[PDB]
Amino acid sequence: QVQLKESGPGLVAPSQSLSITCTVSGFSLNSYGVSWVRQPPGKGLEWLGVIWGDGSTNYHSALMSRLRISKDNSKRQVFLKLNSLQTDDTATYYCTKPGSGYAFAYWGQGTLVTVSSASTKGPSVFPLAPSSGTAALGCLVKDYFPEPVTVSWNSGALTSGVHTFPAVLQSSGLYSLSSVVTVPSSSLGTQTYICNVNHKPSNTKVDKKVEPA
Amino acid sequence: ENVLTQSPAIMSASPGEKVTMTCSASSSVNYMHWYQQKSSTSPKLWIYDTSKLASGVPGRFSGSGSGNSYSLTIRTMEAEDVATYFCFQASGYPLTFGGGTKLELKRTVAAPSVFIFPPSDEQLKSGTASVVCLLNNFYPREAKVQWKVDNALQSGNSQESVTEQDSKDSTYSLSSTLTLSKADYEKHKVYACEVTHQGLSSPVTKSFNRG
Ligand SMILES: CC(=O)N[C@H]1[C@H](O[C@H]2[C@@H](O)[C@@H](CO)O[C@H](O[C@@H]3[C@H](O)[C@@H](O)[C@H](O[C@H]4[C@H](O)[C@@H](O)[C@H](O)O[C@@H]4CO)O[C@@H]3CO)[C@@H]2O)O[C@H](CO)[C@H](O)[C@@H]1O[C@@H]1O[C@H](CO)[C@H](O)[C@H](O[C@]2(C(=O)O)C[C@H](O)[C@@H](NC(C)=O)[C@H]([C@H](O)[C@H](O)CO)O2)[C@H]1O
Numbered sequence: 470q471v472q473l474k475e476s477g478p479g480l481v482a483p484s485q486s487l488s489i490t491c492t493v494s495g496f497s498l499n500s501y502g503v504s505w506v507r508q509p510p511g512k513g514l515e516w517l518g519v520i521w522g523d524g525s526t527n528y529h530s531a532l533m534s535r536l537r538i539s540k541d542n543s544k545r546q547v548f549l550k551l552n553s554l555q556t557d558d559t560a561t562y563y564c565t566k567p568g569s570g571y572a573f574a575y576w577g578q579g580t581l582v583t584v585s586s587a588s589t590k591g592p593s594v595f596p597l598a599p600s601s602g603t604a605a606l607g608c609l610v611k612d613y614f615p616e617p618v619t620v621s622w623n624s625g626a627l628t629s630g631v632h633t634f635p636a637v638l639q640s641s642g643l644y645s646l647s648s649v650v651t652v653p654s655s656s657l658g659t660q661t662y663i664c665n666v667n668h669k670p671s672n673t674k675v676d677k678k679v680e681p682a
Numbered sequence: 683e684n685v686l687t688q689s690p691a692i693m694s695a696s697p698g699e700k701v702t703m704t705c706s707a708s709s710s711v712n713y714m715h716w717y718q719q720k721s722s723t724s725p726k727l728w729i730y731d732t733s734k735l736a737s738g739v740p741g742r743f744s745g746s747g748s749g750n751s752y753s754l755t756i757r758t759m760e761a762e763d764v765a766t767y768f769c770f771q772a773s774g775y776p777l778t779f780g781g782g783t784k785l786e787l788k789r790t791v792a793a794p795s796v797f798i799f800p801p802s803d804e805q806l807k808s809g810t811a812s813v814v815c816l817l818n819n820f821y822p823r824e825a826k827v828q829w830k831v832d833n834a835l836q837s838g839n840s841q842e843s844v845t846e847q848d849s850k851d852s853t854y855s856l857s858s859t860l861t862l863s864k865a866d867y868e869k870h871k872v873y874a875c876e877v878t879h880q881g882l883s884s885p886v887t888k889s890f891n892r893g
Binding site for chain 2 (some may be wrong): 504508513514515516519527528529530531561563567568569570571572573574576577578579593595596597598600603605607609611632634635636637639645646647649651
């Protein structure tokens with residue numbers, strides 16, 4: 470089974486360099502090319518470059534030679550190095566394997582890179598308590614930087630009826646979001662509801678139990 | 683470079699309706715490929731070599747074209763087809779993507795369910811009050827949410843967020859968050875959000891009194 474996974478920094482300062490590793494399995498890098506794609510926030514897909522099985526490379530010229538791709542077959546790793554970052558390099562970066570038609574048949578999950586000189590901030594998590602039969606309850610995830618945060622409920626056991634809202638940028642320059650779920654009011658006496666919040670840039674992991682006030 | 687342009691940029695289709703979207707290239711290509719992206723997670727290969735479906739793609743999808751002119755067609759729109767679709771050429775360098783067609787499902791009107799949440803004691807402790815109004819599972823997306831504090835309409839102190847269409851029921855949900863300092867929060871008693879939506883005969887108000 471073909472698999473790719475990116476690992477990179479979430480936050481990098483303007484004029485510094487971006488380094489991302491793509492770790493692969495299920496195919497030999499000696500035999501197959503790996504491309505890189507990015508998606509700026511709210512925008513479309515941009516092809517950045519490729520390293521072929523033979524190690525030859527091709528880059529989008531718009532990058533002004535700031536990009537290099539390299540790889541080490543025995544480590545099963547492909548490396549993106551992008552120099553002299555500016556604000557508009559902020560994007561989700563993907564590695565991908567060309568397959569059928571030379572189109573991108575398998576993709577990594579993507580890693581969000583934000584270009585900013587602002588400090589990393591972990592979120593505070595607060596409950597959105599069910600009111601005193603369908604009940605709504607949730608978590609408010611406040612004042613974090615950069616994106617993203619992930620939210621699950623009961624360690625992934627609760628998915629039906631969950632809505633995790635896109636983050637909003639506050640006037641402070643920090644993000645906030647809420648996650649809510651609707652559940653039967655008759656479950657409130659027997660079922661514990663915990664939101665699990667992760668902010669990887671700050672290594673923040675919060676589990677917040679949400680109960681009637 | 684071979685710039686790819688997609689039309690329309692945004693479209694909506696009724697359930698079961700035929701959908702067609704186009705990709706135009708600035709220079710001729712031998713083959714066009716297409717991806718489906720849902721909620722900004724990894725794109726999925728959908729069609730390759732103009733008309734060949736990727737594994738697992740349902741038969742209601744097809745692709746066609748030649749030269750500079752390509753299209754993607756869905757025989758019958760289904761709720762699971764709500765996504766953004768991107769064309770892509772790999773016939774010459776640089777490899778290029780079109781800007782995307784966002785495809786939406788036009789379903790029936792559904793009124794929101796409305797909930798209001800006061801700030802937690804924990805948050806007040808630290809000096810800030812966030813009051814949250816939730817609009818759950820509604821259609822269409824257009825909704826008006828107004829905050830009133832002691833019956834005075836608020837302005838400039840709230841922000842909204844809206845989900846993508848739900849994968850199965852195709853509705854939206856929306857939050858509106860009112861943010862005040864603890865001090866300003868304690869200058870008032872009644873916090874209310876008023877929701878106007880085409881699914882509701884008249885506006886729906888949810889409120890609480892501090893206490
Ligand atoms: C061969 C070639 O020129 N490759 C180019 C590639 O050209 C394509 C491309 O532009 C597509 C459009 O996207 O159009 C043509 O291809 C047509 C169809 O898309 C395609 O599906 C079809 O495939 C046939 C196949 O050829 C038959 O063998 C098979 O039986 O049936 C299928 C399905 O019908 O062929 C159609 C044309 O007849 C073009 O030919 O374009 C890309 C850019 O997008 C590159 O320019 C490709 O060239 C690569 O160049 C580098 C050097 O810069 C390398 O030489 C690379 O070779 C390797 C590699 O080192 O990575 C050699 C490896 O041995 C090989 N691995 C294996 C297991 O064979 C890999 C591997 O093929 C690739 O990494 C992709 O995973 O390639 C060249 O591929």
